């Protein structure tokens, strides 16, 4: 059957006894794997000033991601544009896109969880600023706009815009502009039936964009039995009691966290409830099953799958896996 | 001998495509690396349909992973458009996954076109000096930020100022900045930058001593006659845009036919100490580029070319590379 297929969002974790740099070639080492075992996309997420992700500037991972895999396409989920010029950013991707013929993806995304003092600074010197910013750089990557001046490298085609979201808010501003949407599901699990459905209701065909294009983000915690699955899973559970206490460290070790989670204490994810969970953690069949089930009720055509696994091996034994669940076809 | 680098401004050149100017950087840059050029350095250009790179972060990327000894980097980012917080993340990531290889250059903007300024800009000469100093601190994980310059990691890309005046030469002296001179820009200057930047030197962090380069463009191939040729591609694109005609890099067989014909040669009516662009064979390149060396101080030349077929261009680089005494990789 016409499963629904698998992508990447890496936002490159930076996980206890292990450095920023290793992040980096962990990035690189999944996306090689990504490429091989059939993931349609592999997406490096903007994360500034937390010493738990590695990658504020995207551009860079993705120029050196593309020049390390072939099929896959390679690009931003996403660029936090509200920070930027889009015509420096069309810039950036325009080069992306002479180095990597049509391989890239823009995927832009809101910069409203970016710290103040952080977002000034990277400002130097709104809901709808963002919108006007998204026109301005689909102008800009459109050489016929009739602009004073070319933006370079001019070649034919360009990259991909996709719009990231976690609100309703972004799903009706997606489908008004007619652009390819994701939207995640791990971090507004309230809203995401609500959500996809407002996106394809609402949506109205735009330029390379004659149908609705929905992408679910997921985190995914696989592992070949539900046991396992849950020592890995534990890693994330204690990142977010330690988060809801003020407690900012670097992912900790599962085996540690298994211990901790079963002392008396927070537990943020235990205490909340939705239509689905949200973080999917199980065996294969398992995770494939509650998959299936978002997937066919959001109409996601992908699901971009993003981890929070202290261990590079355990993290991916977890792709891998999925990859067999899916029936991916290696490349 | 005076070390030899590269700086890559990426020309677009006739017949072909941006695309084959990038492809054509990652070749020299590698060729650069395997004939031990000590830096390989990417320029930014904006809006010119002639030169391929306007995020020289990209092309570094890319050519760092292709490339094992050589350093890399930027020459340079133009910091005046750019949050100086910005420029030190991409910078840091870079330097994250090329540890202790990546330069930061940073050049003026004052020869970007205004509306294209103004739409990078998204809304003074001094101005620039205090973004530099923003830029150092975001650069220094003990500066006391109320935040973290992520990704952290020991060390840091080495900063280097490009100038092609005076008062940019005081500047980095008076920073204790690494200064690299664009002669080909400003060669009226060039001696007096040069000489004001070593006699105004204040060490600075981790530069305890002037470090001058000296960027030059040359056209070297093995005879002066066939010099002449490849370098009739320039001469011919100054004539171009002399009258406000602008197109890619031309041919070089047209353009010494063309260079034949009356008409203006900016290049010929003007006269400086040293030739704005520096041509000919081997011993007569190597001979002036040393002149010019010895006179400024310059430890390193950062080799600048407007050649328009790819294989002229490498050889240019590679009889360069034999003729300074190069030591391969
Ligand atoms: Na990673
Ligand atoms: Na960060
Ligand atoms: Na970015
Ligand atoms: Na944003
Ligand atoms: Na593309
Ligand atoms: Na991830
Ligand atoms: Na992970
Ligand atoms: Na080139
Ligand atoms: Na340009
Ligand atoms: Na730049
Ligand atoms: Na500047
Ligand atoms: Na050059
Ligand atoms: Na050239």
Same mark, same amino acid.
């Given at each position: ?18 450095? %920023?740099?290793?992040? @980096? ?9 990504? &490429? +091989?075992?059939?993931?349609?996309? =592999? ?8 010493? =738990?992700?590695?990658?504020?500037? %995207? ?9 390390? *895999?072939?099929?896959?396409? $390679?690009?931003? !989920? ?7 010029? %889009? @015509? ?12 990597? #013929?049509? +391989? ?5 995304? +809101? ?7 952080? =977002? ?12 006007? /910013? ?15 001046? *070319? ?13 990231? !979201? ?12 007619? @652009? ?26 735009? %330029?390379?964009?004659?149908? #609705? ?11 070949? *039995? ?14 977010? /009691?330690?988060?809801?206490? !003020? ?16 002392? #008396? ?19 294969? &069949? ?19 799958? $993003? ?5 590079? +091996? ?18």
């Amino acid at each position: 059957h016409h499963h629904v297929k698998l992508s990447v969002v890496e936002q490159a974790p930076v996980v206890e006894g292990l450095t %920023p740099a290793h992040s @980096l070639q962990h990035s690189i080492e999944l996306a090689r794997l990504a &490429d +091989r075992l059939g993931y349609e996309r =592999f997406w490096v997420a903007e994360h500034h000033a937390e010493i =738990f992700n590695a990658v504020p500037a %995207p551009e860079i991972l993705i120029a050196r991601i593309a020049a390390e *895999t072939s099929g896959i396409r $390679v690009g931003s !989920g996403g660029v936090l544009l509200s920070l930027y010029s %889009p @015509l420096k950013v069309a810039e950036v991707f325009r080069t992306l896109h002479a180095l990597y #013929p049509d +391989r890239i993806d823009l995927g832009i995304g +809101r910069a409203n969880r970016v710290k103040l003092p952080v =977002f000034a600074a990277l400002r130097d010197d709104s809901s709808d600023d963002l919108w006007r /910013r998204l026109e301005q750089l689909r102008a800009y990557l459109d050489p016929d706009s009739g602009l004073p001046f *070319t933006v370079s490298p001019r070649m034919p085609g360009g990259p991909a815009l996709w719009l990231l !979201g976690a609100s309703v808010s972004s799903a009706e501003a997606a489908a008004r502009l007619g @652009l390819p949407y994701a939207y995640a599901h791990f971090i507004t699990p309230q809203f995401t039936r609500e959500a996809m459905d407002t996106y394809r209701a609402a949506f109205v065909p735009g %330029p390379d964009t004659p149908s #609705p294009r929905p992408i679910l983000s997921v985190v995914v915690c696989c592992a070949e *039995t539900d046991a396992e699955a849950q020592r890995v899973y534990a890693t994330h559970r204690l990142f977010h /009691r330690r988060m809801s206490q !003020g407690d900012v460290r670097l992912l900790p070790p599962a085996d540690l966290a298994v211990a901790e989670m079963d002392k #008396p204490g927070p537990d943020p994810l235990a205490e909340e409830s939705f239509e689905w969970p949200r973080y999917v953690v199980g065996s294969p &069949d398992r995770v494939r099953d509650q998959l299936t089930k978002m997937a066919d009720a959001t109409g996601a055509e992908e699901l971009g799958v $993003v981890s929070m696994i202290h261990d590079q +091996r355990d993290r991916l034994r977890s792709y891998r896996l999925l990859a067999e669940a899916f029936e991916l076809t290696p490349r």
